[PDB]
Design a protein around this ligand. Sequence first.
Ligand SMILES: O=C1c2cccc3[nH]nc(c23)CCN1[C@H]1CC2CCN(CC2)C1
Ligand SMILES: O=C1c2cccc3[nH]nc(c23)CCN1[C@H]1CC2CCN(CC2)C1
Ligand SMILES: O=C1c2cccc3[nH]nc(c23)CCN1[C@H]1CC2CCN(CC2)C1
Lengths: 395, 395, 395, 395, 395
Amino acid sequence: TTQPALLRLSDHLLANYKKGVRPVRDWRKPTTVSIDVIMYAILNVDEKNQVLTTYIWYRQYWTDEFLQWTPEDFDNVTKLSIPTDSIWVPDILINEFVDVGKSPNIPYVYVHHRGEVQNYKPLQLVTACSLDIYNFPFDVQNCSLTFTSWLHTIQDINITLWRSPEEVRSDKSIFINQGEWELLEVFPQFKEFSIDISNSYAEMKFYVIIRRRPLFYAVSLLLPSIFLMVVDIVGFCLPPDSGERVSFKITLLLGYSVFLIIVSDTLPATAIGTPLIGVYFVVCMALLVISLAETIFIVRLVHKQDLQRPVPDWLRHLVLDRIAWILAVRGLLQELSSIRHFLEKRDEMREVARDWLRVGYVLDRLLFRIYLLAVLAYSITLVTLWSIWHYSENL
Amino acid sequence: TTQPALLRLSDHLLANYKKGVRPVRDWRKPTTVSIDVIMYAILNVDEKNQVLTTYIWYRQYWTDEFLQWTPEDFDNVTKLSIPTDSIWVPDILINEFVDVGKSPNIPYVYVHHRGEVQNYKPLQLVTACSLDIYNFPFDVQNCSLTFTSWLHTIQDINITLWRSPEEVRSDKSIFINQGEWELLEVFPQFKEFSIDISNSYAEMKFYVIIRRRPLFYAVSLLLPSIFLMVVDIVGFCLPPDSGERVSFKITLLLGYSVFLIIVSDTLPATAIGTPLIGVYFVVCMALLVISLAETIFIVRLVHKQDLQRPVPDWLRHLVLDRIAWILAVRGLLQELSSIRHFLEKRDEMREVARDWLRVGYVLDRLLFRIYLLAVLAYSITLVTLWSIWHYSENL
Amino acid sequence: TTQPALLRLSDHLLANYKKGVRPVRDWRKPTTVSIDVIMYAILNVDEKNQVLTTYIWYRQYWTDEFLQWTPEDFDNVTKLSIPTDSIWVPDILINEFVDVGKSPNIPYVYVHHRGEVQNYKPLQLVTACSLDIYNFPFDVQNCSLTFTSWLHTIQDINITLWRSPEEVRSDKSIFINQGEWELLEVFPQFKEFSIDISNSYAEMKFYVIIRRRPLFYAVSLLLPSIFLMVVDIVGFCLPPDSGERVSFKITLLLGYSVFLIIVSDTLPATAIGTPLIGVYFVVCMALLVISLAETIFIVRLVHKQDLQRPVPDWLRHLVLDRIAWILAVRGLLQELSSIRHFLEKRDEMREVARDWLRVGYVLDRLLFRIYLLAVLAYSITLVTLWSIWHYSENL
Amino acid sequence: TTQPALLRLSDHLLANYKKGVRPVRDWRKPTTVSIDVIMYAILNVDEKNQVLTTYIWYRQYWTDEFLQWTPEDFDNVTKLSIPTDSIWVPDILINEFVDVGKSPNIPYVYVHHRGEVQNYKPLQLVTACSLDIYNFPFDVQNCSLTFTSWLHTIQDINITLWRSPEEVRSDKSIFINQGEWELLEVFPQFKEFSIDISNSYAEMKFYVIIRRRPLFYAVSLLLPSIFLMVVDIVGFCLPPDSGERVSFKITLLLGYSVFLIIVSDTLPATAIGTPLIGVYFVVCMALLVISLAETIFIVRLVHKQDLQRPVPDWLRHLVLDRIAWILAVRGLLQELSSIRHFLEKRDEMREVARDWLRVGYVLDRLLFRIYLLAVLAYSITLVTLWSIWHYSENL
Amino acid sequence: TTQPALLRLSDHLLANYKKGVRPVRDWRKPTTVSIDVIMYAILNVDEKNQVLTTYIWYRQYWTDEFLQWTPEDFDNVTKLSIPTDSIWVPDILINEFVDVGKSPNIPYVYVHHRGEVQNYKPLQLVTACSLDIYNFPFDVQNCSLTFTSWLHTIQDINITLWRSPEEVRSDKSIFINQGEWELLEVFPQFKEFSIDISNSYAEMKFYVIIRRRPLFYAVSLLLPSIFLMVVDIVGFCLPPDSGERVSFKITLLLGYSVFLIIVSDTLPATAIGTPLIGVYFVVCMALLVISLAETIFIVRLVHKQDLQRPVPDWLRHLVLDRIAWILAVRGLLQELSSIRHFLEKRDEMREVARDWLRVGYVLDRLLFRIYLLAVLAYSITLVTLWSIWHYSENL
Ligand SMILES: O=C1c2cccc3[nH]nc(c23)CCN1[C@H]1CC2CCN(CC2)C1
Ligand SMILES: O=C1c2cccc3[nH]nc(c23)CCN1[C@H]1CC2CCN(CC2)C1
Ligand SMILES: O=C1c2cccc3[nH]nc(c23)CCN1[C@H]1CC2CCN(CC2)C1
């Protein structure tokens, strides 16, 4: 028997090992597969249709009972590499998968004596995760990965873990911290999945916690919003000169409204979408629009000869609002006296025109008070969100 | 015969089972496959080209007659797992499929004694469904899934059901209610599909009813439309000051017209597309445009020296419209008397200019009445649609 | 021989049938394949790069001569199902294909006695068709599908038809009439394709006629164009008040020019692209632009002190254009007489200013006549196109 | 031996023909493969990342020496069809390939007596070609296709040609002239590719010449540019009325600037991108912008009380520029004499205001001369490019 | 033994060579694979999600010990081509891979006497690289390619290099210099990758250095920015005529703001994105916006009757700012004397109105000084970046 050790061991082991039979000697005992998953990177988190792209490394060992050999005979060999198509491989397939594939297959597997069979493989998974667009700048996502056997039951395949849960929870020795997402926790759990009154199935759920790094996003979205909160600072105190005022706003109401389009284009729009900023930015504009509507109505009322409607209706309006906020010489002298009346009529109009500019100069201050309350509330909401974002990582 | 039970059973059963033969002993009796489908999630409903993406779980059992064995001999075994490439698998393929695939294959199947053969598999299907864009905010879609054998006839393969129709109709124990679509009914039906005068085929149609969750869509599309229905409230009562009016509209007619582009971009445009809102929003603008055209024509007519055309033609126009809506001192006194005529001519023009501002102040009220009728009709249509949406789920 | 009939027939037939040999007994006679195609739906017609997506059903029968058996022996069997990888399958591949695939393979085929071999399969084809963008609203496309053997010649494989051409021409019993395209005719033809002076090849061409359903497209593109043809109705008769006129157009020349962008975005742009509407809509704007240029030049000429250039050059211009369209008291009286000259000079300017507003009021009518001729021609062209569209289906 | 001729020939030939051995009897002589390529269509020419999509037909013959038979024995057979997986196929793979595939495989090949082995197959190739965006409207592209054996050397596989180069150069009998590209020349060449000092490899390069059909592109891009070159014709001769002028340009500087966005969107943007039109259209606007800046500065200088700076600095500026272009009655008469001075002061301002409007009326003519020189140069460049485009096809 | 040499050698060698066994005779010695990589082109560098597309050529040799033969016997043969599926191929797979594939497989490999086994193959790789958007116009990217065995350890497979590192570092004999990226260095390194306390793995890292060719990008982005830095040159010295000024800016603040959208669209936006230009262009606009806000506030203060607030508060404001920058005849004469007071009142207002236009004419110069400092800093930053870009290639 002048043959190499590896060739003689491969000939002896795979001579009659038929694939298809669950490898076990008594059908009573189930076979156990133990798994391990380590994260490498996060490629894409698309919020339009709840798609998460992940890359992981993997490892699965299962005891075997038709590949036992004594190392004393075959020249002290203790580990062999065999093709993956010549033995039995369990159908451990992850759930919540969309277009699974895009990952090569490893054509070799290890085997030890007694049946310790190991396998290493990469998985590039496109999964379905319920992403919450709420708290957009500082979101904390909680995604799930479900490993189970698609066919076998609890009394056929049981899934345990290689290493303990703790050492699995904190594992960032391979992950690259260059993307826009950062790992927090990979928590494993095991339970049983039964739907009808007949079959019992194993199940292992990995909960993956991710945070978003928002420093760069903030400086490109918030800073322009805080800088554009000087428009109220600019247009202030000009009811008589509301021609210039209206000028100002008629162009400002479009200057940021034109890029509101590109802002909404840059938002990862979600059908179930209600961001805190995306509703404050809307009511901010609504309030500004109604303020300008009130100012235009006031200047239209006071610009004409209406004289703020001196009928007692405006008294009632003011009262309700206050409750709410709780022979030749004959011709000579004739011509002399004729023009004095016209001059007096010309001169009398100035005070009458200028006496009706107080209502706008009063109500603009209340509108500005409402605006300051709104921006203070917005800042408080932003501060407490950032506080929640910072305190989310203490656990 | 010192061999394991599973290996000896696999050797005995698959020794001479040739694949290809329909498994039956008398060609007269047909084989029956029974199916079951459970929904998991809805990934995409693209209305541009009638594409529906669905994920389901599946289950198919077929009686077999060359895999019968007695459990008394082979150590009380009652269920075995065998490779899927060593036996006969029916070609149950769903119709209305586009780019079917993207789903793994399960390499194992169960077998019981007597021939009970089972199979579990996931299907990710991209189907063609006739989606109705009408009733966009609150649509109720009715899609169809057709299972049949692509080759075999009614006397070769018959498709029945595992569980009864009722228990199949109400099955939401696995479905995730996080997307923008919500399951209502999965109704199964069975019939025969024959086109020529020769072949008879089995057919099972699953009708799937889906609704759209429109709360988030409403607050992002309707609320701005209701808020922008204050433009008529702002521009009111100013025929003499139609310079400011025209100012107002010339900018409002673009302020929402510029984002009408992004609105139309966000609509899932369909060739066969006529949404109730998408036609009301158009006639709303048309009516506003023609109202502004009438006001501009009126102010152009009354601004010049035409004096609303005092010829009797305007009497006829008003009548038809009413039917429609059913030595030195000599020079001294001379110079004194010369300027009085010029002053009188200057002063007489004011009343003549101000006496022709009534026609616009009358017709704007009728235009506003038409506008109020339009918005009331729009609100009534929205209310009855929401009522239909709410009452669609009582069945 | 206590064996089932099907297993014994499969063992007898496929025992020595080697695949690869054209199934025939004398190499002289060629084998004939007969095909049949039925349309299901049209998924996409992309005009950017001449891509047509179609789904069809299929059917091909070929006589066989190594699978003959007598039904008297094998228990009165007359039809058998055999795997598709164990027999000879012709390489009938369609031409004009791009990324062909995306369609499953049927693993079974029928066989009768004497050699009648049948096969059913679906084909999802992405073909290259020369689409004419001309007559965009109402196009009638004529696409081609070419079936031939990629390798074999006329004396090896001949392609005939299952059913007659007539019954093939009118076949809409399966087609779904929910899309934007509607079937008209599926005409089959057979001929020979030879390019060099040596090989002769069979060829079957199916001509497919499709029409577009333009009702929904019309109401979304034409109706706004007809509604926006009121701009000339609005801006009419105002040469002295050309400040307001210029106001009007300077904003109208952008109001539809801003969404012209989105219009051109919505057009399926084709390199070889010259739609009748897409050239009329351009010359429509050109004519309007040159009309406004003429009006602005006229008002600039008449606004200043040029007084329409009273030099005899304008006489020549008008003639050529007409051819084209075929001690104290001393100071007292002094001061009295000094101001009368200034008053007369002030009063004399009004008639001189108002006497030069006729040329624009004359040429605007000619410009409007040209505009009415243009819109009448546009309406006539639209009417005759729709007439061609309606009369295209009488055949 | 009562067997069919084809079955007996297939049994005799493929009985012991092992695949893998280069088919030759003396390892010294190399085997020669002869190829032929015929073009069908051009699907896509993407200039963003240098991707060319092509479809071709193909043909390759190689002498064989283990499939020789005498036609006298096997019933006068001279041509046989054999599966492509049972014989030796050379690894002739094209270089410069990206995502090669998307094309079916032909499962049969011809064989003659003596070893003449033929093969026909379609190839759909996505190649990398250096496309020059320069001369965009009328480009002449020169792409390369490189056929070589990926493994074998010059003394193992040599690649010659089926037909001569001339008959290969002019081959448009199958090509469809409906796209935006038109074939000019398919020139074959053969040489040797060696990089190190050890291996020698065969290489066949097909140079493919393509032109663009620009008639439709011209009418959609140039005609609007020539039509919009009337803006200088419109705004001419109005320094005093520069309010209307500034009005005009402030809106024209945006009227085409707003669709400049969509123009740049429609350009196939290339990183290495410098089109002749794309630089002329930019300098055209730059020149117009600086002209308007000069006019606005001039009108701002002459509008105020600066009076074109009558200090001798403007003399130096003009000189340098010219070098560059090479008791009661007492009160009565008092009041009479008081107002005459005010009237004279009022009347004297008109000539002083009107005497400073010449500098703009002089410099605008020079600016227009520069503009005319620019447009004449642009037209000359366009004419000579079209001349180059027309003369490129004379070869 | 009248057989060809190649057929007899193939029969002798592959007669009993079982695949799967690592080819070695004593399990103690490991097998060594030596690799070589040569770059061809760079197809895509997408900065949105860190994707790098590369094309390389490859070469791997491994000693074999079951394919030794003596050339004396088998007719002086020294090199043979054998199928790649009949021997042992190591699983050398690159790390950092996304959707690896898209590249054909070579079905043949070389073998020499003694076991020298060679293989050539192309790889089209989509890898994940951390691209730095900082220094956008002139970036120097440093990407990594990691070759290792996915399964085998250091004592099973060791990876060395064919040629030395130097000759590998400088290799541009095949690379095409037509794209937007240019090769600088391909540096190889070898080390060991161990994560736990048990397994030791080989690892070869190729560092690839790429630069961007920014000439064409510069002329399309910078030149417009330098040309648009004349807006401050145009609007200068006009506090009284701030109506025209405000006119100017209200349109300039939108003229480039409208294409800022398309600028941001053309930027390859990265979540971690902070380009030097992209922050200078923002603060440039911020500074201009606040300058215009100050000017509008100043002109609003000085336009009304406030008279720059002559209360001593403005003295304190100026001081703090300076610290910061460190019977008939009776009626006759009566009427004569009445109008003189009105004339004096009319004439006195001019000097009072004109005496308050100095503060804006002073502060605009300081604002322009800040603007000049900003643009000088921007130019200095651009110059030093280009200097870094030029000096990066000296190594
Ligand atoms: O799809 C099903 C399924 C499909 C159709 C009808 C059904 N009735 N009851 C079940 C079921 C539960 C079994 N399953 C799978 C559930 C999990 C766990 C293990 N395995 C894969 C995923 C099995
Ligand atoms: O990739 C290589 C190659 C790869 C790595 C190191 C190398 N050093 N020297 C070469 C080389 C030249 C050989 N080739 C191919 C070149 C052409 C011609 C034939 N064949 C395919 C394409 C072989
Ligand atoms: O994925 C793993 C891996 C997966 C799961 C748990 C693990 N614990 N420890 C390791 C590991 C290290 C081994 N690897 C691979 C690491 C590199 C080097 C060689 N090979 C491929 C890539 C092996």
